[PDB]
Structure formats: C-alpha cells, structure tokens
Design an enzyme around this catalytic site. Structure first.
Site, PDB file in Angstrom:
ATOM      1  N   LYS B 211       0.758  -1.401   0.040  1.00  0.00           N
ATOM      2  CA  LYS B 211       0.162  -0.042  -0.105  1.00  0.00           C
ATOM      3  C   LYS B 211       0.645   1.424   0.070  1.00  0.00           C
ATOM      4  O   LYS B 211       0.628   2.159  -0.995  1.00  0.00           O
ATOM      5  CB  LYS B 211      -1.134  -0.047   1.152  1.00  0.00           C
ATOM      6  CG  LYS B 211      -1.950   1.242   1.221  1.00  0.00           C
ATOM      7  CD  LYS B 211      -2.864   1.131   2.333  1.00  0.00           C
ATOM      8  CE  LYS B 211      -3.938   2.156   2.388  1.00  0.00           C
ATOM      9  NZ  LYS B 211      -4.988   2.339   3.242  1.00  0.00           N
ATOM     10  N   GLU B 217      10.535  -4.535   4.853  1.00  0.00           N
ATOM     11  CA  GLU B 217      10.692  -6.105   4.486  1.00  0.00           C
ATOM     12  C   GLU B 217      10.249  -6.141   3.243  1.00  0.00           C
ATOM     13  O   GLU B 217      11.030  -6.736   2.392  1.00  0.00           O
ATOM     14  CB  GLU B 217       9.707  -6.904   5.080  1.00  0.00           C
ATOM     15  CG  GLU B 217       9.868  -6.956   6.692  1.00  0.00           C
ATOM     16  CD  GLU B 217       8.908  -6.052   7.623  1.00  0.00           C
ATOM     17  OE1 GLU B 217       8.819  -6.429   8.716  1.00  0.00           O
ATOM     18  OE2 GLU B 217       8.676  -5.013   7.246  1.00  0.00           O
ATOM     19  N   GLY B 272      -5.279  -2.358   4.378  1.00  0.00           N
ATOM     20  CA  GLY B 272      -4.401  -3.410   3.985  1.00  0.00           C
ATOM     21  C   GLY B 272      -5.035  -4.555   4.472  1.00  0.00           C
ATOM     22  O   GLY B 272      -5.257  -5.656   3.461  1.00  0.00           O
ATOM     23  N   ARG B 273      -5.368  -4.875   5.668  1.00  0.00           N
ATOM     24  CA  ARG B 273      -6.185  -6.020   6.104  1.00  0.00           C
ATOM     25  C   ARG B 273      -7.790  -6.386   5.557  1.00  0.00           C
ATOM     26  O   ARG B 273      -8.388  -7.321   5.712  1.00  0.00           O
ATOM     27  CB  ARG B 273      -6.261  -6.131   7.615  1.00  0.00           C
ATOM     28  CG  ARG B 273      -7.074  -5.162   8.296  1.00  0.00           C
ATOM     29  CD  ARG B 273      -6.709  -5.133   9.781  1.00  0.00           C
ATOM     30  NE  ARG B 273      -7.307  -3.864  10.309  1.00  0.00           N
ATOM     31  CZ  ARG B 273      -6.495  -2.680  10.544  1.00  0.00           C
ATOM     32  NH1 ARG B 273      -5.325  -2.561  10.301  1.00  0.00           N
ATOM     33  NH2 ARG B 273      -7.174  -1.967  10.964  1.00  0.00           N
ATOM     34  N   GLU B 358      -5.580  -6.984  14.465  1.00  0.00           N
ATOM     35  CA  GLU B 358      -5.075  -5.626  14.096  1.00  0.00           C
ATOM     36  C   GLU B 358      -6.040  -4.639  14.142  1.00  0.00           C
ATOM     37  O   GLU B 358      -6.042  -3.127  14.187  1.00  0.00           O
ATOM     38  CB  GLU B 358      -4.383  -5.522  12.677  1.00  0.00           C
ATOM     39  CG  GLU B 358      -3.368  -4.384  12.618  1.00  0.00           C
ATOM     40  CD  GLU B 358      -2.333  -4.412  11.394  1.00  0.00           C
ATOM     41  OE1 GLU B 358      -2.912  -4.240  10.201  1.00  0.00           O
ATOM     42  OE2 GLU B 358      -1.258  -4.539  11.462  1.00  0.00           O
ATOM     43  N   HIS B 389      -6.355 -33.663  17.519  1.00  0.00           N
ATOM     44  CA  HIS B 389      -5.145 -34.546  17.960  1.00  0.00           C
ATOM     45  C   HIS B 389      -3.916 -33.620  18.582  1.00  0.00           C
ATOM     46  O   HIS B 389      -3.076 -34.164  18.473  1.00  0.00           O
ATOM     47  CB  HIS B 389      -4.602 -35.486  16.463  1.00  0.00           C
ATOM     48  CG  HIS B 389      -5.961 -36.136  16.276  1.00  0.00           C
ATOM     49  ND1 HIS B 389      -5.940 -37.524  16.761  1.00  0.00           N
ATOM     50  CD2 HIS B 389      -6.877 -36.167  15.413  1.00  0.00           C
ATOM     51  CE1 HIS B 389      -7.018 -38.243  16.116  1.00  0.00           C
ATOM     52  NE2 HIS B 389      -7.407 -37.483  15.124  1.00  0.00           N
ATOM     53  N   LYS B 519       8.810  -0.353  14.479  1.00  0.00           N
ATOM     54  CA  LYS B 519       9.556   0.045  13.449  1.00  0.00           C
ATOM     55  C   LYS B 519      10.584   1.045  13.630  1.00  0.00           C
ATOM     56  O   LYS B 519      11.745   1.069  13.363  1.00  0.00           O
ATOM     57  CB  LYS B 519       8.661   0.566  12.422  1.00  0.00           C
ATOM     58  CG  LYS B 519       7.755  -0.263  11.691  1.00  0.00           C
ATOM     59  CD  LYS B 519       6.530   0.505  10.752  1.00  0.00           C
ATOM     60  CE  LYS B 519       5.636  -0.342  10.172  1.00  0.00           C
ATOM     61  NZ  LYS B 519       4.871   0.151   9.381  1.00  0.00           N
TER      62      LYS B 519
HETATM   63  O1  LIG Z   1       1.117  -2.748   2.332  1.00  0.00           O
HETATM   64  P1  LIG Z   1       2.112  -2.082   3.075  1.00  0.00           P
HETATM   65  O2  LIG Z   1       2.080  -0.603   2.961  1.00  0.00           O
HETATM   66  O3  LIG Z   1       3.601  -2.628   2.762  1.00  0.00           O
HETATM   67  O4  LIG Z   1       1.977  -2.844   4.434  1.00  0.00           O
HETATM   68  C1  LIG Z   1       1.914  -3.884   5.046  1.00  0.00           C
HETATM   69  C2  LIG Z   1       1.218  -4.068   6.448  1.00  0.00           C
HETATM   70  O5  LIG Z   1       1.916  -3.497   7.311  1.00  0.00           O
HETATM   71  C3  LIG Z   1       0.929  -2.973   8.392  1.00  0.00           C
HETATM   72  O6  LIG Z   1       0.848  -1.250   7.867  1.00  0.00           O
HETATM   73  C4  LIG Z   1       1.326  -2.798   9.678  1.00  0.00           C
HETATM   74  O7  LIG Z   1       1.096  -3.815  10.487  1.00  0.00           O
HETATM   75  C5  LIG Z   1      -0.204  -3.458   8.051  1.00  0.00           C
HETATM   76  O8  LIG Z   1      -1.424  -2.857   8.321  1.00  0.00           O
HETATM   77  C6  LIG Z   1      -0.242  -3.634   6.614  1.00  0.00           C
HETATM   78  O9  LIG Z   1      -0.952  -4.664   5.969  1.00  0.00           O
HETATM   79  O1  LIG Z   2      -0.251 -42.069  16.689  1.00  0.00           O
HETATM   80  P1  LIG Z   2      -1.527 -42.340  17.070  1.00  0.00           P
HETATM   81  O2  LIG Z   2      -1.737 -43.717  17.826  1.00  0.00           O
HETATM   82  O3  LIG Z   2      -2.292 -42.575  15.718  1.00  0.00           O
HETATM   83  O4  LIG Z   2      -2.345 -40.931  17.753  1.00  0.00           O
HETATM   84  C1  LIG Z   2      -2.233 -40.015  17.196  1.00  0.00           C
HETATM   85  C2  LIG Z   2      -2.837 -38.705  18.174  1.00  0.00           C
HETATM   86  O5  LIG Z   2      -3.792 -38.930  18.719  1.00  0.00           O
HETATM   87  C3  LIG Z   2      -3.927 -38.857  20.211  1.00  0.00           C
HETATM   88  O6  LIG Z   2      -3.972 -40.054  20.744  1.00  0.00           O
HETATM   89  C4  LIG Z   2      -5.057 -38.079  20.653  1.00  0.00           C
HETATM   90  O7  LIG Z   2      -5.253 -36.563  20.105  1.00  0.00           O
HETATM   91  C5  LIG Z   2      -2.678 -38.102  20.395  1.00  0.00           C
HETATM   92  O8  LIG Z   2      -1.981 -37.959  21.453  1.00  0.00           O
HETATM   93  C6  LIG Z   2      -1.863 -38.758  19.465  1.00  0.00           C
HETATM   94  O9  LIG Z   2      -0.540 -38.082  19.068  1.00  0.00           O
END
Ligand SMILES: O=P(O)(O)OC[C@H]1O[C@](O)(CO)[C@@H](O)[C@@H]1O
Ligand SMILES: O=P(O)(O)OC[C@H]1O[C@](O)(CO)[C@@H](O)[C@@H]1O
Lengths: 557, 557
Positions: B211, B217, B272-273, B358, B389, B519
């Site tokens: 924007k 970045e 932006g959002r 935000e 899980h 910033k």
């Molecule tokens: O599109 P820009 O101007 O690069 O901004 C990127 C993002 O940084 C922010 O301005 C700050 O988080 C957001 O609102 C925006 O989406």
């Molecule tokens: O490895 P399994 O026996 O397929 O279980 C998968 C996952 O399901 C659970 O038993 C229940 O969320 C987890 O603890 C486990 O990591």
C-alpha cells in the site's frame, strides 16, 4: 481445594502479587539495576553452540524469583523429575513410565522399566532406522519397477505428524542428498488427494505412523494410499517395497498387511506428543540423514542433563515454567505466544500447541480433586517479522496481557546480500521486545505530533492513540544457529518446561482422556450420514446440521 | 469511563449475566425446547449455495439475544454501518473513508468520497487486472528471453500477503491453467532465498504488493529479487517484463523502477487487512482466473447487501459480533478459535488474526477515553481434524472457556473413495460440537467404566479423569461448497462481524498506530549491529542480547 492452592509457598506468592505487583514496572526495574540482564539470564554453553535464555524483561524481582523457586521445591519438582528419569510410572492414570528421555539417552546409562533396561531395544530400533536410511538414501532400496525412491510420504496425525513435519521444515538446509518428504495427516480427502497427484507410485515410499495403529484418520489415509498404489502396481507383493510402519501395535500392523521387517517399533512410555525422538522420527532421519538425526537426539540429551543436574534457580526449563506459573496463576493470562524469528521454524508454535495444550489442558489432580486454579495456557503464534504486520497491534495496544517468547538464531542459513536480511531480522527481534517493555510516553508522542505539523486540535485528539503503555513482558531466547543439535536442545527445553508446570499443578501431563468423547460421538454419527433418511437421534442442532448436509450435498453449483 | 460501559443496555446485560448465567445449561436447554435449533440459526440462501449459521449451541436464551440486539441498536450499529457504506470518513484518526465494500460493489451504485464517485476508478483497475490476467495466463505475455510466464511471486507482508495467500490456498482446485503462485513475505532471507532457488528469471513474474511502497521488508525483498533478476538479464529495460506493483504510492513505485503501466492502483480507503478485493488480489486473479476473482467479489457483495438490508435480529455478522461481545465482555474469554474442517482453508485462521486483532486490538475510544473493558480477542486455530489431535484436549478438559467457530463445506472438492473421507470429516465436525455441548456426567462415565470391567478401586481412581463438564459453546457454519463465491461471502461476513464489534466498543477498527514504535526502534538498532564494538545505548537486556549476537556470529557450526 487442590494441592497447589493449599500450598503455603503458593499462598505467599499470591498474597505478594496482590499487595505488590502494581509496583512492578519493567522500565523502573532496569533503571534501578544495571546488573538486571546479568542476573536474569542464562547463557548456556552446549559445546555445540550457545543458548541464551534472557528472562530479564519479565515482571519479576529477585524476591519473586526466590518465591517461585521455593514453590517449585515445595511442589516436589526435583523428586518428580528424578522419578521420570528413573522409569517410575509417573503417568498414573494409565500406569505407564514416561521415557522420551530414554530415546535420546546418548550416554546409554541403564534406564529400567519393570526391572529391565530399555536401552538395548531403543538402540536396536535406532540401528534399524540407520540401516533403512542407508538403503533408501543411497538408492539401493528399489521400488516395484526397480527405480530409486525420490519421495517419502508420512501418514499420521497429531503426535505422529507434527514433530516430523516441524523438524523437517526447521532442518531443511540439512536435507541435501535426501528424498523429498510429504506429510499427510487430515482425514479431509483433499490432503491425500493433492499429495498423491504430484507423485509416482514407482518412486514413492509411504510411512504409516501411528502409536496405536487404530486411529481412524491414519488407517483410512493409509488404505487410500494402498489403493492408489495397487491401481498402478497390480501386485499385492509390491506393497512391501513401498509401505513401512511406525507403531507399538505389532498385531494391527500385520493386520493392515505390512511386512514384519518393515516395522519400526516404539513403546507405551513414549507419548505421541513426545515421540519424534523414537521410530516416529524416521521421516526426519530419511530427509536429513541419520547423522543429523543423532545430532538432534544429542541436543535433547544435553538439555536433559542440564534439567537433571542444575540447581533450580539457574535451571532453564524450570525458570521458564515458573515465569509461566506467575503469569497464569497470579496475573491470570490465558495465552502464551511463541514467536520464532525464523521462517524455517514456521511450524514450531503448532508443534507446541499439542506439546503444551494436550499435556496440560487438564482439570483433575493426582488425588482426583478438581483444580480450583488455572492450568495450561492457549499456545499460539506466527514467525517474525510477519506477526508484526498481523497481530502485534493487539499485543502493543490491546487489552490483553500476553507473555511472549521471542526466538532467533544469531547465524542464518541464508546470509544473502552480505547479511542484510538477517541484520534487519535481528534488529526487529531486538526492537520489538524493547518496544513492548518501554512503550512510548505522552511527552515523546506529543513532540512527534508537533514535528509532523499537526494542529493543536489534531494533536490533542491523536495523542492518546499514539501512546504505548508498555510494561509488556517477554522472554528472548537466542541461539548460535538453528542446527539439528540446537533444535533438539530447544524442543527438549520446552518439553521440560511443560513437565515442571504439570507437576506444580498436580496434574498428569502425560495422558489425554479428553479426546475420548469426541471419538465416541463421531463413531455414532458416521453411519447416520449415509442415505436419505432423516436423523433424529441427537439434539436439535446436531439433527439440524445433518438435515442441512443431506439436503445440500446433491445441489449442483 | 467509556461508551460501552456507560451504556444502560450493557449494564443491564452484565447484571443479567451476574444473576442468571450460571443457570444456562446447554444440555438442558436442548432437552426442554425441541425448537432450539430453529430459533437460533440462520439458513441463508445466496442463490449460489446456502450458508447455515447455527448459533444454537451458545450460552444464550431468547432474553439474552433480545438484550444483545437492543444493545447493538443503542450503540448505533445501523447508522455506523450506513456511514461506512456511504463513504463517510469513519476512520477518524486518519481522516479516511473505509470502503472495501466499494471494491466489490457489483451493482455500481455510486459511492462518493469528497463528492466524487469511486466506482469508475475501482472498475478501471479491475479492467486492467482482467486484461493483464488474460495476457499472462494465455501465455501471450513473454519474459526477457521470449518465454511464457510459469511462476508468479507475490512480495508483500501483512495485508499485502495474508489475503492473497489464504485465498489462493482455499481456491486451489480453481487454479488449473494458471501459473504457479509463490508468496515471499518475511524479511528473513530464508524466505526469498528458498523461493528464488526454485525459479528461473526468464519465466518468473514478481508482484510487489505494498500500500505504502515503503515497508522495509517488502522493499528489501523486492530489491533482492530485482538484483537476482538483473544478474541474469543484465538489462534494466527487461524489468518491465518481470515486475509489477500493487500500491497507492505512484512516486515510490516509479522510484523503485517500475513502469507506470505496470502499476495496479488502489486507494487510501482500502485498509491493508481489507485489501484482497482490490489490486492486491492480482495474484488471486492470476492463479485462478479473473472470472473466479469476480465470483469472489460477488460473494462478498452478497454478504454486504445481507449486512446492509437485514434486521439486526436476523443479520449474520451482527449476531456473530453480539455473541462475541457476550463472551468477551460478560464471560471474559480472551480468545476466539476458528476451526475450519477443510485443509484448503488452512490459512483462514491466520488471515483473521490480522483482520480481527489488528482491527480491534485497541484501547482508545472515539471520545478519547481509555477503554475500561475488554476489546478484541486473540484469534487462533488449526483446521479439523488435525486440531482434535493437538489441542482439543484443552478445549474439552482445560480451565479455559473458548468460543469456537466450526466451519465446513457440505460438498468436498475431492470426493475420493466414494465420499468416505468426507463422511468421516463431517462426522467429526458434528461430533465435536455435540461433545463440547453435552459433556459426560460422572454417572455416565461410571457406567462406562463398570461395563469395561474395571474393579471398584480402578474405577474410582480413573472416574474423575473421564468426566467431561461440557457446556462449552460453539458456532457451526456450514455451507454448500467452498466456491469462490461462497468464500467471498464468508470473508465478508467476518469483516462485518469485526466492524460491528468495533462500533460497539467505540474504537477505530481501521487504524493501526500500534505498529509504529517497533519500526522506530528497529531503525535505531540496525546500524548498531555493525562492527565489534559493545552497545550500551539501551536497557541492559537489549545491550546484552546485542553483545551475544556479536560474540556468537563468527562461531563455526
Ligand atoms: O502494504 P504495506 O504498506 O507494505 O503494509 C504492510 C502491512 O503493514 C501494516 O501497515 C502494519 O502491520 C499492515 O496494516 C499492512 O497490511
Ligand atoms: O499415533 P496415534 O496412535 O495414531 O495417535 C495420534 C494422536 O492422537 C492422540 O492420541 C489424541 O489426540 C494424540 O495423543 C496422538 O498423538
């Protein structure tokens, strides 16, 4: 009441918080004590890199840390730790040992369960993994048409998915010479369908990862993969070249039709969410090589020894645990943010959602009494700097207190543009915690508004919007480089943090009874969805949703 | 105090909550009233599919809903909405209109800002997007060596990243015939480095999305991409074949070196959002086609009209907002979980982290008063069934109240195994909210344990651990299919939920002052990282972390 709230050290801490916490201001704590960083940080030398755990930007004084350490002692943390490491059956609801530490016990010092050293079997399975990794990575293991394997597909959910996915993502730079790795987890047919669309049955090897080998999602996905494979191969005997299993359930692995020599075993004392160190890590070892997998184990072992040998007052996982207790049980913070400034670590928060929340999202104590206090927090987060442009607005200027762990490697895996990107990344990492602590005073913001050419009326109106209250606490965890060893140490550190918090809350960090009800009700609904008949067996919402599904599923859009 | 807390309708609601909320029991509410689903759900016919918003599993009665609707009226929601739609400058801290609704205004009814209709310019840019998409997707647009474009790379962060990423992921089945799409966002050099490693400068088109066109970045990433490109092309005129810009800042776009005919403009009244509907959506249109992009806009437009024209008591975004207020300001719930049972929707929760947090992570009201109540919640979640899980243990048996939105399409994009996977997915979607509502009483758990053959001692020990307290509220949002149109409607629905909550809290949902300090402080730290000299210019933590970076950056690992 419960064990924690009946504890006099906890009562003292809570009373101190009530009387004094309003006097705790981060800016003031640093101004009053130039030694604050030195006294409230741990610089750990692992001999394979340093890990700095800087907890100085927390709302704590020396007295608070002392009270917290005393509470850990009077809640039995030291004894409980020793019990875990010795093979005591501390998973008390299931009567099981808790021995993920045995999986990475590089010293090979005997660890007994039921009077029997578990290390020979741990090492037998590791040897089997190493041999399999050689066969696959070298190209010696051939598919049904005689071609080398190019793609590995891990099929599993929860503990059989998140660890291997997170670690292979984090250690991507170490994967030269390794096959591509894919992770199928969701029962949602999209997951396996989009994965299989990009693969050849001739060169793809499936790893069926499941502790129980009965999880509906995993077995169904596995069966879909086998159907897809056999469509091309047309030979049931070829399955042995393309399917292996990671499990504790020998019988169920045989029932599925997998070769006995194709089974990599683990044990009931390996919790799913603590399993990447076992046979479950086979996809990690295949991707980055067995040497790097051993380095991962060794890093965890280093941290295990740190946890075991270090006095509580300078014990990293203990201190992280205690700060968490302070924020959860005294300040009442619901959440804990994990903010890695590292794209490779993009699945780190998701991993600890299970590690933390499935472990400590509990409400019944060892005595059977209901807790009358908070337990595990909601874990969340996204990598920096992305989060800064998503939700940091709320962290800085919302109405929630949110303890944050900021994590970063000093050295980047990709020092492009003579290190320019990493310089900027580090600067943001440092600036954000500084900003969260310091805020911005009215006098600072007012001058900025004046210099921006704002009218007196506009300045007046805008001023409070531009002020940052600050006093928002963070941990900064900085490490030399995200190597296999250092990653192993970091994961183990949080494992032990979770353990310490569980002991202090008097809960069982190692069971998961809370998943049972949803499973039971899903089994009942599954057969009701077939056919056109109205479903009336549930509450009006469930019935109404099913009615909508049956009415809408044939509509052509 | 603040507008919400000073409001008599709010104090009445809060008093009612204090006196009566403990008597709201979901299991009993459903048993007593067979019409509950019918009275607490909205079945919306869009003529391009149905969206069922089932809010019956919430801790509400007719009286509660009446009080909430009255509160919305008292807070001037309707007038505020009309002001947004008419182009009034409701972003009062920035003196800007808020007109994401204009971007998708398919009716082309004039919407004026400063006395001038914005629709001609909205449509001019859309026409430009359409023409560009045709040229690229057909293969007509050639790179600097005369080859068709195979890869599109969006470079942007936050609002210039999350929308396009989430939507291209969600609409992946609609991308056949389109170029591959990549998203580079983090300054972390890993992000651009690993992306560029898989690309050819001859066939890659970069989209610089920003924007302001000054975000560090994004501009750094863009400059890195340009350097990489020019190393191969060695001709500055070739940049016009490989770089386009999405921005409001013509001067900075020109300064970067992008052709004016390669700029896709948007406007200051596009947050932006809230920007994926604008030129920022170019990567969406390139990936899935402009026709599908238009369908996405059309879905949002449908929901805009629903929001604009529907009585509050039957108005979907309003009701979702009010339920949110109920949990945030009366129950005190910090978080809101978004749980789509759809792998394609895996970035939906991350998107609404920015959109919600935000927007409403704010603390100053329109009157200048600091809020003396909670504002925006922490938004989090992972797609089902994976979440079951990972962290549902905590949702079922932890100590936190967590309002959850469960979302699912009736029709899957991949009906593999004759619909078996989707049958299981739907069964889990339905079972989980049923389970959260119903729980399991001690006597119910006792009978189950007795049937299992547990001894009196074993039963008594395990019993409390097997109890589910239930009474955990959810929304279920079920829709015919996740088409571009329906996705557009769903995103807009949440946009308006966020708007309604912001109005009720008397905050500005449309600024983001809370990102400035981080910033500023990063700019200060940047040059300090250069060289070997110690930094003493900050607090001892920031100083100490910088010392660690300087000490550790030369170590070989
Ligand atoms: O599109 P820009 O101007 O690069 O901004 C990127 C993002 O940084 C922010 O301005 C700050 O988080 C957001 O609102 C925006 O989406
Ligand atoms: O490895 P399994 O026996 O397929 O279980 C998968 C996952 O399901 C659970 O038993 C229940 O969320 C987890 O603890 C486990 O990591």
């Amino acid at each position: 009441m419960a064990a924690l709230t009946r504890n006099p050290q906890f009562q003292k801490l809570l009373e101190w918080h009530r009387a004094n916490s309003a006097n705790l201001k981060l800016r003031e704590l640093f101004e009053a004590d130039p030694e604050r960083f030195n006294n409230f940080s741990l610089n750990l030398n692992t001999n394979h890199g340093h890990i700095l755990v800087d907890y100085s930007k927390n709302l704590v004084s020396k007295e608070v840390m002392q009270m917290l350490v005393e509470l850990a002692k009077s809640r039995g943390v030291e004894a409980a730790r020793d019990n875990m490491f010795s093979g005591s059956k501390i998973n008390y609801t299931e009567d099981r040992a808790v021995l993920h530490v045995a999986l990475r016990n590089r010293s090979n010092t005997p660890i007994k369960v039921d009077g029997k050293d578990v290390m020979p079997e741990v090492n037998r399975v590791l040897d089997k993994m190493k041999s399999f990794c050689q066969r696959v990575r070298s190209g010696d293991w051939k598919g049904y048409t005689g071609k080398s394997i190019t793609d590995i597909i891990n099929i599993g959910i929860g503990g059989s998915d998140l660890g291997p996915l997170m670690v292979t993502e984090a250690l991507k730079p170490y994967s030269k010479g390794g096959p591509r790795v894919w992770f199928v987890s969701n029962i949602d047919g999209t997951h396996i369908a989009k994965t299989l669309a990009s693969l050849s049955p001739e060169t793809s090897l499936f790893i069926i990862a499941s502790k129980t080998f009965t999880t509906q999602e995993t077995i169904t996905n596995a069966e879909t993969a086998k159907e897809w494979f056999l469509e091309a191969a047309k030979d049931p005997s070829a399955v042995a070249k393309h399917f292996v299993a990671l499990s504790t359930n020998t019988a169920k692995v045989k029932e599925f039709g997998i070769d006995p020599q194709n089974m990599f075993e683990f044990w009931d004392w390996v919790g799913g969410r603590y399993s990447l160190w076992s046979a479950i890590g086979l996809s990690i070892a295949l991707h980055v090589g067995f040497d790097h997998f051993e380095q991962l184990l060794s890093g965890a072992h280093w941290m295990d020894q740190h946890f075991l040998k270090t006095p509580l007052e300078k014990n990293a996982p203990v201190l992280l645990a205690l700060l968490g207790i302070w924020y959860i049980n005294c300040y009442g913070c619901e959440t804990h943010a994990l903010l890695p400034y590292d794209q490779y670590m993009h699945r780190f928060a998701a991993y600890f959602q299970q590690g933390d929340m499935e472990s400590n999202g509990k409400y019944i104590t060892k005595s059977g009494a209901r807790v009358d206090h908070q337990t595990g927090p909601i874990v969340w987060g996204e990598p920096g700097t992305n989060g800064q442009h998503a939700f940091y607005q709320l962290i800085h200027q919302g109405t929630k207190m949110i303890p944050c762990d900021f994590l970063i490697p000093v050295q980047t895996q990709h020092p492009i543009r003579k290190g320019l990107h990493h310089k900027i990344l580090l600067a943001n990492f440092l600036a954000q915690t500084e900003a969260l602590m310091k805020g911005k005073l009215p006098e600072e913001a007012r001058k900025e508004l004046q210099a921006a050419g704002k009218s007196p009326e506009d300045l007046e109106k805008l001023l409070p919007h531009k002020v940052f209250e600050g006093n928002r606490p963070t941990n900064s965890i900085v490490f030399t480089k995200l190597t296999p060893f250092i990653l192993g140490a970091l994961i183990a550190m949080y494992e032990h943090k979770i353990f310490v918090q569980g002991i202090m809350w008097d809960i069982n960090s190692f069971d998961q009874w809370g998943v049972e009800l949803g499973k039971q009700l899903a089994k009942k609904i599954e057969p009701e969805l077939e056919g056109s008949s109205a479903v009336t067996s549930h509450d009006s919402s469930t019935n109404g949703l099913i009615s909508f599904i049956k009415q809408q599923r044939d509509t052509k859009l």
